[PDB]
Design a protein around this motif. Structure first.
Motif, short mmCIF file in Angstrom:
data_model
loop_
_atom_site.label_atom_id
_atom_site.label_comp_id
_atom_site.label_asym_id
_atom_site.label_seq_id
_atom_site.Cartn_x
_atom_site.Cartn_y
_atom_site.Cartn_z
N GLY A 177 -84.86 7.34 29.29
CA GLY A 177 -84.12 6.48 29.00
C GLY A 177 -83.70 6.89 28.02
N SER A 178 -82.94 6.22 27.16
CA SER A 178 -82.19 5.78 25.29
C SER A 178 -83.03 4.85 24.87
N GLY A 179 -84.16 4.70 25.46
CA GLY A 179 -84.67 3.55 24.26
C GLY A 179 -86.11 3.66 23.24
N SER A 180 -86.84 3.40 22.95
CA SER A 180 -87.91 3.74 22.54
C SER A 180 -88.86 4.12 23.02
N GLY A 181 -89.39 5.55 23.54
CA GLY A 181 -89.76 6.24 24.58
C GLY A 181 -89.44 7.19 25.54
N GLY A 182 -88.11 6.68 25.60
CA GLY A 182 -87.63 6.81 27.06
C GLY A 182 -86.97 5.83 28.03
N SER A 183 -87.34 4.44 27.63
CA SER A 183 -87.34 3.32 27.85
C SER A 183 -86.20 3.30 28.74
N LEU A 184 -85.60 2.58 29.50
CA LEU A 184 -83.70 2.09 29.83
C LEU A 184 -83.98 0.89 28.86
N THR A 185 -82.56 1.91 28.36
CA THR A 185 -81.44 0.01 27.89
C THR A 185 -80.39 -0.01 28.80
N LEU A 186 -79.85 -0.78 27.76
CA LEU A 186 -78.69 -2.00 28.60
C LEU A 186 -77.53 -0.82 28.72
N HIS A 187 -77.14 -0.06 28.06
CA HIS A 187 -76.56 0.81 27.72
C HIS A 187 -76.50 2.04 29.17
N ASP A 188 -78.09 2.66 28.87
CA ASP A 188 -77.94 3.32 30.16
C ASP A 188 -78.09 2.69 31.50
N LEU A 189 -77.96 1.53 31.93
CA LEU A 189 -77.88 0.88 32.93
C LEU A 189 -76.04 0.82 33.15
N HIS A 190 -75.56 0.66 32.66
CA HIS A 190 -74.27 0.71 32.27
C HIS A 190 -74.00 1.86 32.55
N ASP A 191 -74.07 2.65 32.57
CA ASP A 191 -73.65 4.37 32.75
C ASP A 191 -74.16 5.07 33.82
N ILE A 192 -75.08 4.69 34.89
CA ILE A 192 -75.68 4.75 36.03
C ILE A 192 -74.94 3.74 36.95
N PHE A 193 -75.00 2.13 36.49
CA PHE A 193 -73.96 1.19 37.46
C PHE A 193 -72.49 1.94 37.42
N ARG A 194 -72.08 2.77 36.58
CA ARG A 194 -71.04 3.56 36.61
C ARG A 194 -70.13 3.76 38.09
N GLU A 195 -71.64 4.84 37.93
CA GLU A 195 -71.75 5.76 39.66
C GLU A 195 -72.62 5.01 40.67
N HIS A 196 -73.11 4.16 40.33
CA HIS A 196 -74.18 3.15 40.98
C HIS A 196 -73.94 1.79 41.93
N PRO A 197 -72.49 1.56 41.77
CA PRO A 197 -72.73 -0.05 42.14
C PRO A 197 -72.98 -1.24 42.35
N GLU A 198 -73.78 -0.81 43.87
CA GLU A 198 -74.26 -0.64 44.41
C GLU A 198 -76.04 -1.82 43.65
N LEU A 199 -76.18 -0.71 43.24
CA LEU A 199 -77.61 -1.29 42.50
C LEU A 199 -77.04 -2.06 41.32
N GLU A 200 -75.49 -2.65 40.50
CA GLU A 200 -75.18 -3.44 40.21
C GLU A 200 -75.62 -4.62 40.47
N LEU A 201 -74.42 -4.71 41.48
CA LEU A 201 -74.95 -6.04 41.88
C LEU A 201 -76.76 -6.64 42.45
N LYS A 202 -77.46 -5.33 42.81
CA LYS A 202 -78.49 -6.05 42.78
C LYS A 202 -79.51 -6.87 41.72
N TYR A 203 -79.29 -5.87 40.86
CA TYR A 203 -79.91 -5.97 39.39
C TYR A 203 -78.74 -7.29 38.90
N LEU A 204 -77.83 -7.50 39.09
CA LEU A 204 -77.59 -8.81 38.49
C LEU A 204 -77.95 -9.87 39.62
N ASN A 205 -77.89 -10.01 39.85
CA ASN A 205 -78.67 -11.00 41.47
C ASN A 205 -79.84 -11.00 40.93
#
Length: 212
Positions: A177-205
């Motif tokens: 992760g790019s956040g404090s201590g390797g935790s995920l940030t929202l920008h990490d989420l956008h980068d992952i969701f670019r490659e895995h759009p099915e996870l983006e739907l599951k997240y927003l839902n």
């Protein structure tokens, strides 16, 4: 992203931002007014698109701003406008430098008159939002008792079930992760969701529970 940007790259960016705005805000088919793509990344006083908001409806404004920042590499600026019997969220790649109406930035509760610009940026949301991990700020437009006025509230939201949220984050940490201590940030989420759009739907839902 600049006045010298190619027409071809600008058209892909414009289509991306328009489609993402429809998806993230859950807009109906006629609820987005779109500016001609030829204008993007030139005169900053024109929006890319304006979303026609309904009242009493949760809109994922923080996530939308963060998505735009991830795609444009610019600091987005969205402006609420009251056109008389509806609020529009006018979405700009960068802050405009001349507005038709006098402008101010959002707080938690706002009263929006006609011929007022009400600006929301990530900087505003960061100031207003709780410090709790994983919160997303949403906005809701309410009918005012006064004619020609709407109220706009910003509200913190979290996941519906902690455990299911944690399991989704685990799927994201398997893609890293790019956040404090390797935790995920929202920008990490956008980068992952670019490659895995099915996870983006599951997240927003699942980001649908208003926080105390």
């Amino acid at each position: 992203g600049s006045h010298m940007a190619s027409m071809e790259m600008n058209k892909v960016l414009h289509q991306d931002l328009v489609q993402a705005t429809r998806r993230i805000l859950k807009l109906g088919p006629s609820e987005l007014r779109v500016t001609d793509a030829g204008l993007i990344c030139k005169n900053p006083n024109y929006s890319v698109c304006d979303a026609m908001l309904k009242t009493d409806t949760v809109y994922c404004v923080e996530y939308l701003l963060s998505y735009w920042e991830s795609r444009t590499d610019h600091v987005p600026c969205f402006i609420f406008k009251n056109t008389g019997c509806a609020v529009s969220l006018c979405c700009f790649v960068r802050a405009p430098v001349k507005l038709v109406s006098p402008a101010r930035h959002v707080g938690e509760f706002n009263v929006l008159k006609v011929n007022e610009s009400l600006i929301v940026t990530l900087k505003d949301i960061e100031e207003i939002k709780p410090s709790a991990y994983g919160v997303l700020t949403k906005c809701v437009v309410r009918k005012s008792n006064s004619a020609s006025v709407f109220n706009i509230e910003l509200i913190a939201f979290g996941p519906e079930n902690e455990g299911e949220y944690e399991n989704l984050l685990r799927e994201l940490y398997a893609k890293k992760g790019s956040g404090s201590g390797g935790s995920l940030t929202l920008h990490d989420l956008h980068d992952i969701f670019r490659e895995h759009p099915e996870l983006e739907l599951k997240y927003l839902n699942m980001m649908k529970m208003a926080i105390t």
